[model samples]
Target chain A: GPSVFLFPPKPKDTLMISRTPEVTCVVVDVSHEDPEVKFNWYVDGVEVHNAKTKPREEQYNSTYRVVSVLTVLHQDWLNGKEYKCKVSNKALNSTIEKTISKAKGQPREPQVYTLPPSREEMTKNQVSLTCLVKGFYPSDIAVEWESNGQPENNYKTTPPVLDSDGSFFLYSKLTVDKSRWQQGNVFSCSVMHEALHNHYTQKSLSL
Target chain B: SVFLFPPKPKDTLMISRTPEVTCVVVHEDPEVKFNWYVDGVEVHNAKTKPREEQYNSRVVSVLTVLHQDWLNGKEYKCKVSNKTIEKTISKAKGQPREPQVYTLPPSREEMTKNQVSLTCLVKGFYPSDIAVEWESNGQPENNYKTTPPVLDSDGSFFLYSKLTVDKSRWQQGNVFSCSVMHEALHNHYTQKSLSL
Candidate 1:
């Protein structure tokens, strides 16, 4: 009787390199002795058309290595767009994936502006004051309302939304009695976020 | 200092197999610790890097999970603690919202003697993965381009696709259609059509 052995392919790592100024190439490496391998590429989760893959080569000692490259425009890379590479083999139960982005996790400060009640709201019994917090990153934030230095629990703050340029903005609205607003009461909106110099940014409004 | 960056879709239009979330802590001391949680259960698979001393001592930790768990709407939290302060921030909850689609004919300014452009607005949707196509009288049209999703002030997303056509054909009362497909919609696409 002859002896036989079975080996499954092992995916190693995904690496991104910029050899050309105009393009970025991402490479995925797979090891271990299998010859059958497949690759796919995605840009921001959308499968790209015609992702390039090359034939597998023998590394040594009968071991095999498979490689695939995903080429993307350097402009997209400069915009912090994400690129992913996926590799799979029949011997593996699950696929291996790697994603890369140029975002540096830098924090950007948010500017707070107080918007007064509209003319339509002024006619109603209640008036809404909005605090527009715009252009921040690392979205966790806390917004609180103060009326003449007292805390007001009745307020609504919208979830932070991503801006077109990858920052975040949100609105915190405080509704008060129209009479109180007409009486020239001072109202304030204070926000707590890590991107601020004091970790707190505030804006105020009054009649 | 403790901060958390919300996990957004890296590929705005499709959910990938692995999604990652990150947490950061900055302090004068380098002994910062990070703990990750998924739906109230502690997870130990997070990857944390050694503290680096820059303007201050900082540490970063990232948690990556399967798309199946993410699509199941699991809430993830990052808790960072040091000798001075401790804080936690959880990922924001999101729900699927159907988009509002409308077609706009080329305005007078967009209309030229030979070519006209049609616009389709798809507004206020979530999970950003969407497909948009243009059709001419029921046939697929290829002269179209769709912009990436733009976020709204209300945490929703909006995008528009533009189709360029011959001005004479549009003036001939030919109908043009724009169709949108999203994960939130069931089976049918949201379509809008316009004619001269």
Candidate 2:
């Protein structure tokens, strides 16, 4: 019997739109041989006027042009909507969506971390801890420690550093003079960005 | 009113070693007393015989006992009947065979201060109940859970877990691993450890 492999290969040029702030950009490369190719832009599945073949810029390797200037009204409608662009020729078709958050840069699912078991075993004097947040963007991030429902005054916050891949990383250290990280104490690292409505918290341990 | 059934002589059940097999009894009567006989001899009552180990602990009523050993072919039977009647024989065949196993990804070795992205992928196996964990300086930082791994259309089972560490955090070495569990091969865990 033949074995089966899941997650089959998909076409490279498939279009996907970000869920937050609905601006869309299409990537087109028409170097391959085809009889005719056309670029079409759509908002909420409706075609926009004058958004057909404009002209390609020499700086980028694209040979196609932006057929029309996207209007402010159209852009506002897409503020929190999904838009798509489809490029097609007689032989094949390709599509791409604009789903990136205008403020956040990219739309990604939350990263979750499972706490170590010893987190519950430490006492007041022995439990000095450091929390790290990686793979984030934007330079401004916050790390805070809350003990018994109040902000920790003695915690140290490190500045955010940029990664070579255009991402960001940061860390915070919390020292417990009397190691009392019991059920009610909490230590959290949050990332605040213009694109996000709420801060992302990393640690929420109970007991 | 008790009815007595005559005892049916046991028949030899033959099997090949290349293909593994299991034997089960499917009769509906709960009062049925089932026994197993091998090689035309009454092996069920010979509890004191050392050679009886081949058939010992290998019998079941509704389901067949799971067996992985296939070094040799053997004859087996299911002797079944209600109480107060002689047992009737139901023969079965079995052959031992081996299943395939896949390997886990290698651990992260070194990461630069803003230059590298580390990812670990585990391949081969179905029902993706696999987990990836990270530890730093003998302290575990995180554990990742994923859906049952899937088999692609080309016939490959895969489980993927990734950790993109920041370059600044790479000042020293860290440890990471990917582990998997499957129904067919229980507790078959694979791991990769890396240092920076």
Candidate 3:
């Protein structure tokens, strides 16, 4: 017989890429030293395709451990869908299952800040406006820059970085021409995230 | 079709004196009946509360036992029946144990001007069912979070509860306490306070 446990992403090392797929890990522990074990993953009760698993590793007391991972869209996890990992060993005629879903911890909203171009950068022909979004949970976020009431597309955003104390932070920069900056047009950073009270937060800067 | 909800039995821990065992049953049928049994023999003296109706009907039953007899250990069961049937069993076991409570201050780095979180850690208690409460300046606080129990290698259990309040409250030296109620404590609370 085997015991199964599903593990969630660690707040210390897990990165939530805003638009990319993320992975969840599951482990199975068996009392016997048998190497032949089947690991299956299911989402919403349907069999999953292309789940990745590792070879069994020996543990203390003649036991062994096997790990399997399933890659899911970042939105699926935030949507609170059910996931289950099933383990079976033919030798023992036993099947064990464990389930996990949803982000299991506290939710904290991001502290949004908009930084205007520095004086040194303001002298350049082109300058960068920085938006710092920090201290949020569940890490799925949307960051956008708007210039003078119009959407701005010339921007780069860093991957959400996990904080040491179990929060997330990231920065996005919008490149603006110095001439446009001198025009005193309002530039705003708008953020959308599940952790936000209104699902939206914005910060703006002007001359 | 009649629906029968699961019967929930409390984990019992008798310390200095014996406590009654309680079990509740919930079902959709209004005419559900309950029976109490101790061991294999039926107990006639057990008390049953009047049936109450909600979205589903509910019934509660309690069994009283002698302290020495309970110390010797016994099994109690509540059987509910309509056309469908279900039973829940509760038994007395384990040694008398008290939990050690600690009120932890927020980490200096984790503390911000807006908020600070305080934690209450309860360690080395048996019979995992324990209730915890947080109080600020003797006023009860709600919505504080308690983590699931973590079992130690030696079989005792431990867990922590967190309470977050404004940093202004901490800076002003408000009194905060974590009060824990466990079956092994003989109905008394083990409290730890952050005096600062």
lDDT of 1: 0.65
**Which pairs in model 3 have colliding backbones?**
none
In model 3, the Cα lDDT at residue B187 comes to 57
Docking class of 1: incorrect
Better of 1 and 2 by DockQ: 1
Choose the strongest candidate by DockQ.
1
- What tens-digit string does per-residue lDDT give for candidate 3 at A1-207? 566777754332123454345455544466574568887888888888788888778877678887887777655666667788888887687887778776667778887766565454455676667676667887767888997678997676666766556877666767788888889889999988777755777788777
Q: After superposition, how far is residue B136 of candidate 3 from its true place, in Å?
A: 4.2
Higher TM-score: candidate 1 or 2? 1
Ranking by lDDT: 3, 1, 2
- Please give the C-alpha DockQ score of model 3: 0.01
Which whole-number lDDT from 0 to 100 does residue A195 have in model 1? 63
- Looking at candidate 1 chain B, the ten consecutive residues that score lowest on lDDT are B8-17
How many backbone overlaps does candidate 1 show?
2
- Score candidate 1 by DockQ: 0.02
State each candidate's chain A TM-score.
0.51, 0.38, 0.57
Best by lDDT: 3
TM agreement with the true structure for every prediction: 0.34, 0.26, 0.47
Each prediction's DockQ? 0.02, 0.02, 0.01
lDDT of 2 at A57: 40
Which sections of candidate 3 miss by over 4 Å?
A: A1-207, B1-31, B44-73, B83-88, B183-187
